[PDB]
Amino acid sequence: AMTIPYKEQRLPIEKVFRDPVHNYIHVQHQVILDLINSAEVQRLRRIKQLGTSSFTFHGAEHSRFSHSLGVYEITRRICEIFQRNYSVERLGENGWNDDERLITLCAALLHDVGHGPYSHTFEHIFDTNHEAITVQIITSPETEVYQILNRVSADFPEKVASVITKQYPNPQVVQMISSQIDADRMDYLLRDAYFTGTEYGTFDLTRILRVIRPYKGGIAFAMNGMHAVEDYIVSRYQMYVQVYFHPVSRGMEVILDHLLHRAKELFENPEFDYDLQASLLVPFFKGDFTLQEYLKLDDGVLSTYFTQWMDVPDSILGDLAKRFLMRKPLKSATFTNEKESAATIAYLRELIEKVGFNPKYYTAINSSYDLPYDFYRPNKDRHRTQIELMQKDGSLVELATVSPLVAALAGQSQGDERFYFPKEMLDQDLFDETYREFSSYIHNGALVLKK
Amino acid sequence: TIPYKEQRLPIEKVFRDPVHNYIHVQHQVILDLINSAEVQRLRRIKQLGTSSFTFHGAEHSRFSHSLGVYEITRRICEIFQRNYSVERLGENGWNDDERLITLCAALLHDVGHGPYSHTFEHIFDTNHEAITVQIITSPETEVYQILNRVSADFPEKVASVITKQYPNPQVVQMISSQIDADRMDYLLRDAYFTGTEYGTFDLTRILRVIRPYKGGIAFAMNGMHAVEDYIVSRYQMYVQVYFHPVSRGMEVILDHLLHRAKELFENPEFDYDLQASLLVPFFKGDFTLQEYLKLDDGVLSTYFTQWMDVPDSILGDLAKRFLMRKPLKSATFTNEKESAATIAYLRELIEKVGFNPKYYTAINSSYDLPYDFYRPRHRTQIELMQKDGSLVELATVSPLVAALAGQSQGDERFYFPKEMLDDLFDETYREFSSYIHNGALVLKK
Amino acid sequence: MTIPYKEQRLPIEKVFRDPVHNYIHVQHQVILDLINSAEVQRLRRIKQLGTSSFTFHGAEHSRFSHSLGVYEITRRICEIFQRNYSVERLGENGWNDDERLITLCAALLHDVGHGPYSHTFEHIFDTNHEAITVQIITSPETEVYQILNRVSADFPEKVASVITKQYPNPQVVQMISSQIDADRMDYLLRDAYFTGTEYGTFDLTRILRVIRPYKGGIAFAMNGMHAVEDYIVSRYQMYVQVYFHPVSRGMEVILDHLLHRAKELFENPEFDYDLQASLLVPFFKGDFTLQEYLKLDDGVLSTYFTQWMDVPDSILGDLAKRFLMRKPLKSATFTNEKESAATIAYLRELIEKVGFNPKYYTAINSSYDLPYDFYRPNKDRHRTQIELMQKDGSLVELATVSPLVAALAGQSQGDERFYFPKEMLDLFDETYREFSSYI
Amino acid sequence: TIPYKEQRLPIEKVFRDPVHNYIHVQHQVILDLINSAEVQRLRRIKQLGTSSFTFHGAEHSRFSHSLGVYEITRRICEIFQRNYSVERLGENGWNDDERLITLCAALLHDVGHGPYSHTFEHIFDTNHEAITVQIITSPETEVYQILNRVSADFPEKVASVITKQYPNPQVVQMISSQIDADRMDYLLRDAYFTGTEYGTFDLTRILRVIRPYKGGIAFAMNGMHAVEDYIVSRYQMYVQVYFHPVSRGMEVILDHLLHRAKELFENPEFDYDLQASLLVPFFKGDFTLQEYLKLDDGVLSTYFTQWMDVPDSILGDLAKRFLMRKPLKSATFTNEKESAATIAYLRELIEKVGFNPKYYTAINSSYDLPYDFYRPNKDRHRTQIELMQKDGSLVELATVSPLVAALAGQSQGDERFYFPKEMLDQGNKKHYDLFDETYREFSSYIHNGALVLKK
Numbered sequence A: 001a002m003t004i005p006y007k008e009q010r011l012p013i014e015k016v017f018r019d020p021v022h023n024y025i026h027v028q029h030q031v032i033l034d035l036i037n038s039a040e041v042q043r044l045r046r047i048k049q050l051g052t053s054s055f056t057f058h059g060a061e062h063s064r065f066s067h068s069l070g071v072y073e074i075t076r077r078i079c080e081i082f083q084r085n086y087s088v089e090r091l092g093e094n095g096w097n098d099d100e101r102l103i104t105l106c107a108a109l110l111h112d113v114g115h116g117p118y119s120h121t122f123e124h125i126f127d128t129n130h131e132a133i134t135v136q137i138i139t140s141p142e143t144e145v146y147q148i149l150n151r152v153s154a155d156f157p158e159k160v161a162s163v164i165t166k167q168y169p170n171p172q173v174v175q176m177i178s179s180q181i182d183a184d185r186m187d188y189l190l191r192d193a194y195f196t197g198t199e200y201g202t203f204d205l206t207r208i209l210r211v212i213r214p215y216k217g218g219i220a221f222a223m224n225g226m227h228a229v230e231d232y233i234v235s236r237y238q239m240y241v242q243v244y245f246h247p248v249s250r251g252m253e254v255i256l257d258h259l260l261h262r263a264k265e266l267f268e269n270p271e272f273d274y275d276l277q278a279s280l281l282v283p284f285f286k287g288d289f290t291l292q293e294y295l296k297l298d299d300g301v302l303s304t305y306f307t308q309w310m311d312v313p314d315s316i317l318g319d320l321a322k323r324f325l326m327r328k329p330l331k332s333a334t335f336t337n338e339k340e341s342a343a344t345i346a347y348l349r350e351l352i353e354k355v356g357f358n359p360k361y362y363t364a365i366n367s368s369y370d371l372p373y374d375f376y377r378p379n380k381d382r383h384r385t386q387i388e389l390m391q392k393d394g395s396l397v398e399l400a401t402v403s404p405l406v407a408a409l410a411g412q413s414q415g416d417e418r419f420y421f422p423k424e425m426l427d428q429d430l431f432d433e434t435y436r437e438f439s440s441y442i443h444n445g446a447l448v449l450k451k
Numbered sequence B: 001t002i003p004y005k006e007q008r009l010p011i012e013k014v015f016r017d018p019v020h021n022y023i024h025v026q027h028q029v030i031l032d033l034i035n036s037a038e039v040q041r042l043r044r045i046k047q048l049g050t051s052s053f054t055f056h057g058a059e060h061s062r063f064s065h066s067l068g069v070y071e072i073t074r075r076i077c078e079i080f081q082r083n084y085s086v087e088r089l090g091e092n093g094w095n096d097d098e099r100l101i102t103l104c105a106a107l108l109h110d111v112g113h114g115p116y117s118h119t120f121e122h123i124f125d126t127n128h129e130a131i132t133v134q135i136i137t138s139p140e141t142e143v144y145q146i147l148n149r150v151s152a153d154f155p156e157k158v159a160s161v162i163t164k165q166y167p168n169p170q171v172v173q174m175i176s177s178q179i180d181a182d183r184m185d186y187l188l189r190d191a192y193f194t195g196t197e198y199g200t201f202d203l204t205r206i207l208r209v210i211r212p213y214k215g216g217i218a219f220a221m222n223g224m225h226a227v228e229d230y231i232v233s234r235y236q237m238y239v240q241v242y243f244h245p246v247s248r249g250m251e252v253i254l255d256h257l258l259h260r261a262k263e264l265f266e267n268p269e270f271d272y273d274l275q276a277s278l279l280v281p282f283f284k285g286d287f288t289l290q291e292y293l294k295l296d297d298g299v300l301s302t303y304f305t306q307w308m309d310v311p312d313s314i315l316g317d318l319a320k321r322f323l324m325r326k327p328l329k330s331a332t333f334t335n336e337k338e339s340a341a342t343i344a345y346l347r348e349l350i351e352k353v354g355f356n357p358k359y360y361t362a363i364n365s366s367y368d369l370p371y372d373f374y375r376p377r378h379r380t381q382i383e384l385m386q387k388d389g390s391l392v393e394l395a396t397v398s399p400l401v402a403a404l405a406g407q408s409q410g411d412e413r414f415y416f417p418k419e420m421l422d423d424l425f426d427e428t429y430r431e432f433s434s435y436i437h438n439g440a441l442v443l444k445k
Numbered sequence C: 001m002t003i004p005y006k007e008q009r010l011p012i013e014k015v016f017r018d019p020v021h022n023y024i025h026v027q028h029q030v031i032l033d034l035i036n037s038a039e040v041q042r043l044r045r046i047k048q049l050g051t052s053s054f055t056f057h058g059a060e061h062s063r064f065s066h067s068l069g070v071y072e073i074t075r076r077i078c079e080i081f082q083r084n085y086s087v088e089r090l091g092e093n094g095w096n097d098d099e100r101l102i103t104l105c106a107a108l109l110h111d112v113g114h115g116p117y118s119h120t121f122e123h124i125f126d127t128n129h130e131a132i133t134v135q136i137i138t139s140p141e142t143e144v145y146q147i148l149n150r151v152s153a154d155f156p157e158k159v160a161s162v163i164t165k166q167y168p169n170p171q172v173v174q175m176i177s178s179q180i181d182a183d184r185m186d187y188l189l190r191d192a193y194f195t196g197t198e199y200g201t202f203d204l205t206r207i208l209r210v211i212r213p214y215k216g217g218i219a220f221a222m223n224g225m226h227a228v229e230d231y232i233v234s235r236y237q238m239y240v241q242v243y244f245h246p247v248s249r250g251m252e253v254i255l256d257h258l259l260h261r262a263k264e265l266f267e268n269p270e271f272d273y274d275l276q277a278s279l280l281v282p283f284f285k286g287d288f289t290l291q292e293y294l295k296l297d298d299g300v301l302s303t304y305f306t307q308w309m310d311v312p313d314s315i316l317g318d319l320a321k322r323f324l325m326r327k328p329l330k331s332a333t334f335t336n337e338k339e340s341a342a343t344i345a346y347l348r349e350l351i352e353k354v355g356f357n358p359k360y361y362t363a364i365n366s367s368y369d370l371p372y373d374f375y376r377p378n379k380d381r382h383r384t385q386i387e388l389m390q391k392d393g394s395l396v397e398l399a400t401v402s403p404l405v406a407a408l409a410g411q412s413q414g415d416e417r418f419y420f421p422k423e424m425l426d427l428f429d430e431t432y433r434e435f436s437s438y439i
Numbered sequence D: 001t002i003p004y005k006e007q008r009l010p011i012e013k014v015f016r017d018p019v020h021n022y023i024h025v026q027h028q029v030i031l032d033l034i035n036s037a038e039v040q041r042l043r044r045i046k047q048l049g050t051s052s053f054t055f056h057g058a059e060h061s062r063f064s065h066s067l068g069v070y071e072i073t074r075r076i077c078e079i080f081q082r083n084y085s086v087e088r089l090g091e092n093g094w095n096d097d098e099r100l101i102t103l104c105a106a107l108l109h110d111v112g113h114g115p116y117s118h119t120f121e122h123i124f125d126t127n128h129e130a131i132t133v134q135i136i137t138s139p140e141t142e143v144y145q146i147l148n149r150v151s152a153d154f155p156e157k158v159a160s161v162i163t164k165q166y167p168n169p170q171v172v173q174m175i176s177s178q179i180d181a182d183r184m185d186y187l188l189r190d191a192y193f194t195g196t197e198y199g200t201f202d203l204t205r206i207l208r209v210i211r212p213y214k215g216g217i218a219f220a221m222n223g224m225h226a227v228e229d230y231i232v233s234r235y236q237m238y239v240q241v242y243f244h245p246v247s248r249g250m251e252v253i254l255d256h257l258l259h260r261a262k263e264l265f266e267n268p269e270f271d272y273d274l275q276a277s278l279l280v281p282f283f284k285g286d287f288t289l290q291e292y293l294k295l296d297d298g299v300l301s302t303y304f305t306q307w308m309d310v311p312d313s314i315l316g317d318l319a320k321r322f323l324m325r326k327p328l329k330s331a332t333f334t335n336e337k338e339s340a341a342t343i344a345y346l347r348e349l350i351e352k353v354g355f356n357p358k359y360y361t362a363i364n365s366s367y368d369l370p371y372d373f374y375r376p377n378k379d380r381h382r383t384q385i386e387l388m389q390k391d392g393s394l395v396e397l398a399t400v401s402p403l404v405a406a407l408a409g410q411s412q413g414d415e416r417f418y419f420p421k422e423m424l425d426q427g428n429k430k431h432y433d434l435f436d437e438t439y440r441e442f443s444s445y446i447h448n449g450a451l452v453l454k455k
């Protein structure tokens, strides 16, 4: 027993957290344990990983907390492997340097810490940015996370954040958390599939762990593992078109967006004279918030305020709050492009209006390209956009050049376009002719462009 | 127009479920119930309460559990109709005319649960069974309007299944018995989401041996082992998950947090605004059904977040302990009588160092918990059906089930702040420590 | 009075545990009798993948389990069709559940004519499994026929017409045989399950959620395009990684040359030795009865091989050792059959210098010859389309709307391999320490 | 050149396996053993014998099981070496010099099994452990020539691990104990192929807590529940799969079929040709290793097909019953002594309708099957699963697990009486009246799957 500095302190016994996806999360460092236990990581239990997806895939109730630990776990497994077989002691200057282990472990655990409730929707209404806030959390002395990291060394908070912002000077560390095949994507693809119940949009983590390699340029995958790397791209693409891009979840998302926007407009309007009782949102209505105010938000804050709003003297706010709480998403139809459809969309909005729906709150144009999921688009100008396969002689070849399957998927390359509207426009009074004519513009789930 | 009662969906509707793969909805009435306000609200209430603090995958809702119970129930009905109908077995067979009502009841069996049900009923004296019946039979609810639209007597009938007075024992026992769709779903779903997996017995195997008869529901003798596996899963799920001390430590905090909130609300000397409008009728002890329906898990945690800044050190700390996961630790003890003197002394030491033992200690046993154990109320027991129709008791023919019945080492725990086991309060902490060895009380005083 | 055979539903359905589908559900007496019949039972002793097990050692599943899986998938389709898309609701574009029994029987029986190592066997002895399937279904001598004849007199021929694609209900025909059918779906899933190529598994439940009858047969909902894509990708992965594997084919060549060599020394009227190959005699002669064929299974051949290891012919004895002890020939990849012709003959003579004959130790082999076909949709042939159905009932060819499926189709995966002994790569050293120049 | 014992393959050779995903081979010795004639023939022998008749997925070979056991053992040795080497725990630690012999013993543990091993040993008085040792220690085999090439004394040492005489308890217990690589693979693999998907435990959690100590192999106390799940899976596989009556019905037919063939061969008056050359040494009770090694499942089934046409009624029919799946039906009974006179009477009745009772009936119990229950003997080290406390002391599993005590206390084995199915049923719409009253008399003794003794 010696004087062990904080950065190297180990728990007397390994701590294990049951996880349905990875079986166990293994924790050996005091620092990592203290981070998991910190106020701002604990906060992630109360924020759903998949936002509105749970309305379509009702198993999708998992938290950002569990995913954060999952990412940590995969990262830990990679570090173990790198140290065992591909260390600096074995391979020299560009081998894995295990002094990088702690920072890589912290970066993995904390990568999503700045996420708020329904963050994609919250960011569009309130001009937050989960990435900026992640950095702020890590480096602002008021957080428990900072106080832990600063106890490692004085510059440790800045270093951890630089990993997340991809400015850290070791590409093996950067690319383990963020690349085209990283611990982050690997956990969420496995976890989202496990909980939605789409268990066939799933690859083999262990085979990928068998072929993952560190090198001078970052992280590559041995050539004999090409097929396992293919399965991963297959899962990635399957999860995108089947789960994340689902029209009904997006329909709920549109409601949420329009709900939060109406609230904000009401708060700012002097002619509106009722109390929204939404104290934790006030700083965001005003566009003037602190990190502390932000850290108080989670999914429950929003739904709690929505419940209180079902009684508001505003018919639109009231209805939108109802729609979100009770699951009444807007319906959608596809169109080709914004330019062509413009005239038809405008006219359908007129019809919707005439029937008593304010088009601003009850319609939207929506694309899957707008969502935070990117396709594999390997480009030799941005090295972190490629998946590299390592040949036996140590040379690298980009995945798509050797895999026709991947090249076919990377070339499927397409995001959709949708127009949203109330279902009651199609469900079937002195509005007969209006509904009849609206329906006639919808065929095979698509806008008929007659105008 | 076709009658609501008979409104079968021309195209089946399916909901992907990670446990059962799909929930199949085949009747308009069932779809309408799933879509109704008071079922939807179950999305916002966690099935397992504080268990997620121990098993972080246990974030599944009462909503997904309710759909699961409905699904297993649908599958038993389909097997009953195909293999054991009245058309074949008469009196001992299944009358599929009962399908709609059995399905509505299975879907709604938990609709009156509030947030952190067990804890909530301890503080505010609510009752989920009674509220479930209220929801089904009160005209103000979407659920009622749907059921009443079936026929005028249908709400009361549906509720009679849940009260266990519906005159069909096959219908009653499908929803509630020792082995029913409810327990089968939660064992499988809890196992699936916690990742414990001990509680994965083979459902299709039980579905293959489940039989109707004149006095309820039995299991074919050739399915004894399948039934044993279910008993084993229950045992495991109870001993490993439901009775977990850490989860119960978080429950004690929640309990004490809500009590302190109530006390402050009633405190003439308390100036601060709790901004807890939805909890107010419960603080006051005068609440309506509509007021109860507005409650969910997110309501409580939102209010706890606001409370973290309250000028009451106890309330502020208890809210922090719940939101930031700082449970009381616990140690086992055997006797309420002999450990008493020792417990009283530990409370002194805890107080000595500045924790109010009313808030920062508790006595807790797994006997208090909502779930129970199998020991052979009106019927509630497992019957094995011989090929000749006669019925045998499971425990009489399975020594394994018999052995586990007598296995109820349900503990007793004293809860206390972790700080006690880790400034010259140091001697007090050491004293306290010497009374605790390997998560168990050392009886000294 | 008593129930017609045609209509004998079991009081309690019978279940067969299957690791792929969890359960095979049997609810008709006709189906149970067929399952229990002599010619279906013999499929237990014939491997589904022949020589693949030498490369993927878990692939020891029989054709019997595959046959039951096809039956089971077919049953699930019918049950869904009846529930949601029956004639009662859709008329002419709907499913008529009176067709259930014939469809299930055909599903179950589709492969009954398969012998041991089917592809190889047909190449040497000139047999045809399709023809034999029909023989079995229509010959008074089989238990299968007796069962079907008991349903009604014309039932055997109707069942067979389903297999031969001549039956007048395209829905019945396409369920068993099309571009995505119960057959393909089971073997892809099962071959994946047993080889352990875990992905190559697609989501069957999603396919069964999107599968639709219509007047011209079987189509798939447009909103299920991605599910259908998942199927195509699995298909591609299985072909490229499993069915086309060179090591498995290296064993196929040995077996081919082993049986072909045994034919020769039986045909050769000179050298006299008891081959002991009682059950192969009719096949050497090319005149066999059906009963003679039905006695053939994997164990028969390997039992003969065990004996052939000591036949005075060193070529046959070696070949038998090689097949029994897993000693496969190696292979390399080239492009043209006319361009490479000079390169082959040179190596042939160099192998003969070692003391082994190129006629039995080399071969020309391509992936395109195997009993597996790529999805190649044509404008004229309706059999080669996967049809997607829009909500208005209009059909769209899968490849028209899926670039991924299109890009995979145009990917002309065609192998071309020359086979040679491993002993080449290592008499004295100065014989085969030369011309390894093809790496 | 590098010594054979140390020879590593240029690149790791991976074998796709549906159970363990991959089998990993690094040693030249292991690759050669896998490739050897005696290991290869395990492809031609089913692991579960007659189980495939009740669970039709169960067609996996003893070969894939052998690679599985090797793989699990390799994973354990790997864990033992990097976490519990002698360099770290000294005396209680793992000595990686033992790796190669342990892998060899794991791969070869079942090499002496012939076709339908349990039935075959009953009729022909073979012993698969004896034969395994023979294959390892006999110069005539490919397996010997590989092992002896390791070193002169290596074959004897490999054999001693299997006979459990080898001095290192860690090596012996990894391969044979109450919780070893052998049991772990077949439980998982048998579950995987039968499709009893919930008859499985978690290999990865056991691997996380498995540990060497001076007296062998133990498991960290923090992994007790995972050890529990292993016992649970073990028990459910026994009761649901291995002990299945229909599978045992087919085994009874196989047993009597082989017995009849032996008897017919021994009859001087019966001069018909059985055409079963490879079985003749076994009929005679005089076989060599080489004659045994030629035997597999395909040899037997081939002979059974010919036997369908042999002019003995009993043999022809039994051969048909085995090829065509016509198992004997069965009824349980609890006590042999009290049931004995009744069984004799039922045997008379069965005989009366034309079924020779010696071939068409049987009595067997699950106790007779090669699956032992967990019964820890407090003074017999080998019978126990040891859990290691934080203090380093060992505590037997049942001692601290009520569930395991409950399962271990419920350890029992049935008793069945087997008879032709046709004794019970009377066709579709009954017509066959000539023995009708005998069928009814017989039927009155079979009730609720059990033999009923009249009062």
Ligand SMILES: Nc1nc2c(ncn2[C@H]2C[C@H](O)[C@@H](COP(=O)(O)OP(=O)(O)OP(=O)(O)O)O2)c(=O)[nH]1
Pocket (backbone or CB within 6 Å): A054, A055, A056, A057, A058, A248, A327, B013, B014, B015, B016, B034, B035
């Ligand atoms: N209706 C409903 N569907 C749910 C729920 N949870 C998950 N789902 C799944 C099953 C549905 O088929 C799928 C799509 O949701 P909707 O039914 O609202 O959209 P869809 O376009 O199917 O509407 P429709 O078919 O016209 O009722 O989401 C729920 O609470 N209610």
Ligand SMILES: Nc1nc2c(ncn2[C@H]2C[C@H](O)[C@@H](COP(=O)(O)OP(=O)(O)OP(=O)(O)O)O2)c(=O)[nH]1
Pocket (backbone or CB within 6 Å): A016, A017, A018, A036, A037, B052, B053, B054, B055, B056, B246, B325
């Ligand atoms: N510490 C901690 N444990 C968690 C969390 N989520 C799940 N768990 C699980 C891991 C362990 O199974 C179990 C242990 O909880 P604790 O660390 O609070 O209690 P314990 O007394 O076992 O450990 P301790 O001595 O308090 O560090 O809870 C979390 O966010 N923090």
Ligand SMILES: Nc1nc2c(ncn2[C@H]2C[C@H](O)[C@@H](COP(=O)(O)OP(=O)(O)OP(=O)(O)O)O2)c(=O)[nH]1
Pocket (backbone or CB within 6 Å): C053, C054, C055, C056, C057, C247, C326, C328, D014, D015, D016, D034, D035
């Ligand atoms: N050697 C061998 N491979 C097997 C066996 N069972 C399955 N396999 C699989 C493992 C490999 O994925 C694949 C390769 O088999 P081979 O070693 O015969 O072919 P390869 O071209 O690797 O020959 P090589 O060892 O490189 O000379 O076959 C077996 O019993 N022996």
Ligand SMILES: Nc1nc2c(ncn2[C@H]2C[C@H](O)[C@@H](COP(=O)(O)OP(=O)(O)OP(=O)(O)O)O2)c(=O)[nH]1
Pocket (backbone or CB within 6 Å): C014, C015, C016, C017, C035, C036, D052, D053, D054, D055, D056, D246, D325, D327
């Ligand atoms: N009949 C039959 N069953 C099989 C086969 N392969 C697996 N099994 C399974 C499914 C059966 O429910 C189980 C029991 O076999 P049997 O049907 O021979 O015995 P059981 O006592 O069920 O006779 P039963 O037909 O119910 O009077 O074995 C097969 O080829 N034929």
Ligand SMILES: Cc1cn([C@H]2C[C@H](O)[C@@H](COP(=O)(O)OP(=O)(O)OP(=O)(O)O)O2)c(=O)[nH]c1=O
Pocket (backbone or CB within 6 Å): A056, A057, A058, A197, A198, A241, A242, A243, B014, B015, B016, C206, C209, C223, C226
């Ligand atoms: C689109 C899609 C849905 N689902 C799930 C999500 C939902 O919970 C459930 C129903 O989804 P739906 O989008 O409703 O799909 P459906 O074809 O079953 O019916 P329809 O579109 O006509 O309503 O199935 C998948 O698992 N995979 C998929 O690819």
Ligand SMILES: Cc1cn([C@H]2C[C@H](O)[C@@H](COP(=O)(O)OP(=O)(O)OP(=O)(O)O)O2)c(=O)[nH]c1=O
Pocket (backbone or CB within 6 Å): B205, B208, B222, B225, C014, C015, C016, C017, C018, D054, D055, D056, D195, D196, D239, D240, D241
């Ligand atoms: C007994 C048993 C059977 N099975 C499988 C084996 C068979 O393939 C299939 C049929 O089992 P059976 O032994 O036939 O039992 P059953 O209840 O399905 O019907 P019966 O007794 O009337 O025959 O189920 C299990 O998976 N688990 C079990 O415990």
Ligand code: NI
Pocket (backbone or CB within 6 Å): A067, A071, A111, A112, A184, A188
């Ligand atoms: Ni992430």
Ligand code: NI
Pocket (backbone or CB within 6 Å): B065, B069, B109, B110, B182, B183, B186
């Ligand atoms: Ni419930």
Ligand code: NI
Pocket (backbone or CB within 6 Å): C066, C070, C110, C111, C183, C184, C187
């Ligand atoms: Ni087929």
Ligand code: NI
Pocket (backbone or CB within 6 Å): D065, D069, D109, D110, D182, D183, D186
């Ligand atoms: Ni074994």
